DNA sequence: TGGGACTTTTTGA
DNA sequence: TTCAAAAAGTCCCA
C-alpha cells in the first residue's frame, strides 16, 4: 500500500492542468492498482473537476448528459481504468468505486483481472499513473522469465526486474502527448542491469521530473529505496527535468501535510538536468558538484586505469575449510609454505592495513593427497561434500580441496593498495605484509612503467582526501544509507594528477603512514597533517 | 517484543 | 579456463 501523501502527489501532478472542457473524456490508467489506492484518488479528482465546471460543460457539449448526477455514471464509463492480477483486490476496487455514489439502471466499470504484460491492450491512455510491483524480484517461474526475455528484450535481459517491463508498458499504451506518473524502486537509475530500460526511456518520453528518496523508508517496514518518475509524450523543445533529491534520509513522511511542503523544504534540493545530455548511467547533480567534478576532471591527465592493474580478491567456495585464526593449533598440521596473510574489510582504514588475524589456507600449492593427508582429512575434508558441490569442483575443473577462484598468489604477495568495495568513506591503504583478502577488498598495484611518476604513498596520499571523498561521491553508486559501493568499474575511473605540489604531498602522506604505524598510538597530528595535505590538493586542483 | 544491518559464493560471460 | 558483478539469511538490543 502506498503512503497515503505520494499517492495524493502523484495523482496531482497528473491531473492538475487538464482542461476538462476541452477534453471532458479522458482516460486514466493504474496498471497495478490492488486495493486501489491511486483510482479513488483519481474518482474524487475527477468528481470535484466536472462539478466544477458542470454548467460550462452544460453549455458547451450536449446540455442533458452533462448533469452534476450523470457524473458518476461518467467517470465510471468513460474515465477510470484498472487491472490487477488478483480477483480479490479487483472486486473489493469495484465495490469501493461502486458505494463512491450510492441500481435503476446497468453500470458498467472499466476494470481488467489479467496479466497487464501480457494483455492485448485495445486503446492508450491520457494518464497513467501507479505503483510497479517489486515483492516479486527473483521468483518469477522459468517459463514467465523465458516470455519476459522474448517479449521485452529492449527492457529486460538476465538480471533484471520484473517492474521495468511495466515502464515499457506504460509508455507504449501511454498517449501522444500523455502523462504518466509512477513510483517505483530506484535503482534502475544507477544499476548496470537498467541501462537499457533507461536508454528506451530517453528516447523516447519526455521526462518531466525525479524525486530520488534515496535511503529513505517511504514504505514502512520495507527495505526499498523508491523514486517518483512523471514524463510525457508532449511536443516539447528543450526538456529539461527537475530533479529533487533528498538531503535528509532519515527524515518522517508522515510529518508532513502534503509531499509539496517535503520538496520545498530544506530536507530536499532541487536542481534542473538537461535530458539531451544524460548519459548511459544518469549521473544527478547539482551545478556546484558538477562544476567541482568538471575541474578534477579537466585537471587530471592520467587515471587508475591508465596506470595501474586491478583484480579481486581470493573466493575460496567454503570460507569455513581454508580461513583460520592465526592462533589456531591446526595450523601446526600445515606447512607454513600453504599459509597466508588474511584479512577482511574491517581491517582496513586509511593509509594502513590492520594486522592479519586470519591465515588462509592456499589449497591449490598442495600436490598430491598422499603427502598432505593430515591437511586434507582433519582440516578442509571437514567440508568435502559441500566442496564437491562447488561448480568447477563437480565440472572437473577444479579438485575437490582446492580454492574455486584462487587468483594469483604474485598479485597479491607484492606493495599494492586495497580497499574494502563498501565503506562510508574513501578508506584506501598500502599493504605491506603481502595480505590475501576475500572478495569483500579489492586491490590494485601500479603498473610497471608507471612506478616513477607515481608512488603508492601518493597515491594514498591524494585518494584518501576530503577532495577526492568528495569527487568519487559524486559519480558513485549509493547502494544503502550512508554505504557507498567502491568497485573497480568506479574506483578505476578515479583520475590522479601530479604537479610541482606532489613532493610535499608524499611526504604528508609518510608522515601520516609513519604516525599510524608507531606504537604510542594517538591520531592527533595526523588529522592536522591530512588538513594541510588537503589545501595542497586544493591549490592543484584550483578548488 | 518487535525490527534492519551486514558478508560469502553463485554465476554469466 | 578464469574474472568479476551481484545475489543471497541470520541474527540481538532497548
Ligand atoms: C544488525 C543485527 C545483526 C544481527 N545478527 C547477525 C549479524 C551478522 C553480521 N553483523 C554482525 C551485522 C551476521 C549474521 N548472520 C549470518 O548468517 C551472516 C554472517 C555473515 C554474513 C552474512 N551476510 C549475508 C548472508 C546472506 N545474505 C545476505 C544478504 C545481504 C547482506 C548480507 C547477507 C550473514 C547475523 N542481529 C541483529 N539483531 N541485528
Ligand atoms: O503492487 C502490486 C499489485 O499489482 C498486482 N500485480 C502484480 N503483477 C501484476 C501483473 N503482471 C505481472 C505478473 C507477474 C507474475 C508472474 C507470475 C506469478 C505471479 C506474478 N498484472 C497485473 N497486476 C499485477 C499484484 O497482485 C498487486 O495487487
Given at each position: 500500500?502506498?503512503?497515503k ?5 502523484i ?8 482542461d ?9 490508467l ?6 486501489g ?8 479528482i ?18 442533458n ?9 461518467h ?6 481504468y ?8 479487483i472486486?473489493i ?11 435503476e439502471?446497468d ?11 501480457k494483455?492485448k ?8 499513473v ?11 517461474e522459468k ?18 526486474d520484473?517492474?521495468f517491463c ?25 544499476s ?5 530500460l ?8 519526455n ?10 523508508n ?9 523514486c517518483?518518475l512523471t514524463?510525457?509524450?508532449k511536443?516539447?523543445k ?20 502534503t ?17 539531451r545530455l ?6 544527478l ?24 592493474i ?6 575460496t ?8 585464526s ?9 606447512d607454513?609454505?600453504?599459509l597466508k596473510?588474511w584479512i ?10 590492520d ?18 593427508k593430515?591437511?586434507?582429512?582433519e582440516?578442509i575434508g571437514?567440508?568435502?561434500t ?9 565440472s572437473?575443473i ?7 577462484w584462487g ?9 599494492k ?41 601518493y597515491?594514498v596520499?591524494?585518494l584518501?582526501?576530503s ?27 578515479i ?12 611526504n ?35 578548488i
Amino acid at each position: 500500500y502506498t503512503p497515503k501523501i505520494i499517492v495524493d502527489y502523484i495523482v496531482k501532478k497528473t491531473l492538475k492542468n487538464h482542461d476538462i472542457i476541452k477534453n471532458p473524456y479522458p482516460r486514466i490508467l493504474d496498471i497495478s492498482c490492488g486495493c486501489g489506492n491511486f483510482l479513488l484518488e483519481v474518482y474524487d479528482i475527477l468528481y470535484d473537476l466536472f462539478e466544477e465546471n458542470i454548467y460550462e460543460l452544460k453549455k458547451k457539449y450536449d446540455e442533458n448528459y452533462w448533469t452534476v448526477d450523470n457524473i458518476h455514471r461518467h467517470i465510471l464509463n468513460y474515465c477510470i481504468y484498472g487491472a490487477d492480477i488478483d480477483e480479490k483486490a479487483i472486486s473489493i476496487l469495484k465495490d469501493s468505486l461502486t458505494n463512491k455514489k450510492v441500481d435503476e439502471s446497468d453500470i458498467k466499470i472499466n476494470l481488467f483481472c489479467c496479466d497487464s504484460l501480457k494483455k492485448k491492450w485495445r486503446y492508450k491512455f491520457d494518464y497513467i499513473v501507479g505503483n510497479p510491483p517489486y515483492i516479486g524480484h527473483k521468483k518469477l517461474e522459468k517459463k514467465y522469465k523465458k516470455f519476459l526475455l522474448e517479449k521485452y528484450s529492449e527492457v529486460y535481459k538476465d538480471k533484471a526486474d520484473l517492474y521495468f517491463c511495466f515502464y515499457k508498458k506504460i509508455i507504449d499504451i501511454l498517449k501522444q502527448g500523455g502523462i504518466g506518473s509512477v513510483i517505483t524502486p530506484r535503482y534502475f537509475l544507477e544499476s548496470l542491469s537498467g541501462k537499457d530500460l533507461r536508454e528506451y526511456i530517453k528516447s523516447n518520453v519526455n521526462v518531466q521530473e525525479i524525486v530520488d528518496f534515496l535511503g529513505a523508508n517511504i514504505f514502512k517496514n520495507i527495505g526499498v529505496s523508491s523514486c517518483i518518475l512523471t514524463f510525457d509524450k508532449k511536443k516539447t523543445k528543450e526538456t529539461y527535468i527537475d530533479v529533487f533529491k533528498i538531503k535528509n534520509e532519515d527524515i518522517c513522511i508522515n510529518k508532513f501535510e502534503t509531499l509539496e511542503e517535503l520538496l520545498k523544504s530544506s530536507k530536499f534540493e532541487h536542481f534542473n538536468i538537461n535530458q539531451r545530455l544524460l548519459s548511459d548511467e544518469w549521473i544527478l547533480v547539482n551545478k556546484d558538484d558538477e562544476t567541482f567534478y568538471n575541474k578534477i576532471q579537466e585537471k587530471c591527465k592520467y587515471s587508475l586505469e591508465d596506470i595501474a592493474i586491478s583484480f579481486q580478491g581470493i573466493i575460496t567456495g567454503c570460507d569455513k575449510a581454508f580461513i583460520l585464526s592465526k592462533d589456531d593449533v591446526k595450523l601446526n598440521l600445515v606447512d607454513d609454505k600453504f599459509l597466508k596473510c588474511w584479512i577482511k574489510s574491517k581491517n582496513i582504514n586509511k593509509y594502513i592495513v590492520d594486522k592479519s588475524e586470519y591465515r588462509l589456507i592456499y589449497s591449490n600449492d598442495i600436490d598430491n593427497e598422499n603427502t598432505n593427508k593430515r591437511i586434507l582429512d582433519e582440516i578442509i575434508g571437514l567440508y568435502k561434500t559441500k566442496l564437491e558441490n562447488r561448480r568447477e569442483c563437480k565440472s572437473g575443473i577444479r579438485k575437490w580441496y582446492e580454492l574455486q577462484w584462487g587468483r594469483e598468489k604474485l598479485f597479491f604477495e607484492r606493495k599494492k593498495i586495497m580497499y574494502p568495495y563498501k565503506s562510508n568513506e574513501n578508506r584506501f591503504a598500502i599493504d605491506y605484509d603481502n595480505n590475501f583478502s576475500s572478495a569483500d577488498v579489492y586491490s590494485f598495484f601500479i603498473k610497471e612503467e608507471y612506478l616513477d611518476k607515481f608512488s603508492y604513498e601518493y597515491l594514498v596520499g591524494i585518494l584518501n582526501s576530503s577532495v577526492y571523498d568528495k569527487y568519487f561521491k559524486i559519480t558513485a553508486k549509493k547502494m544503502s544509507k550512508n554505504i557507498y559501493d567502491y568497485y573497480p568499474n568506479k574506483v578505476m575511473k578515479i583520475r590522479i594528477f601530479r604537479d610541482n605540489n606532489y613532493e610535499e604531498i608524499e611526504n604528508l602522506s609518510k608522515q601520516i603512514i609513519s604516525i599510524l604505524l608507531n606504537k604510542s598510538i594517538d591520531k592527533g597530528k595526523v588529522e592536522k597533517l591530512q588538513i594541510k595535505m588537503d589545501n595542497l590538493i586544493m591549490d592543484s586542483l584550483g578548488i
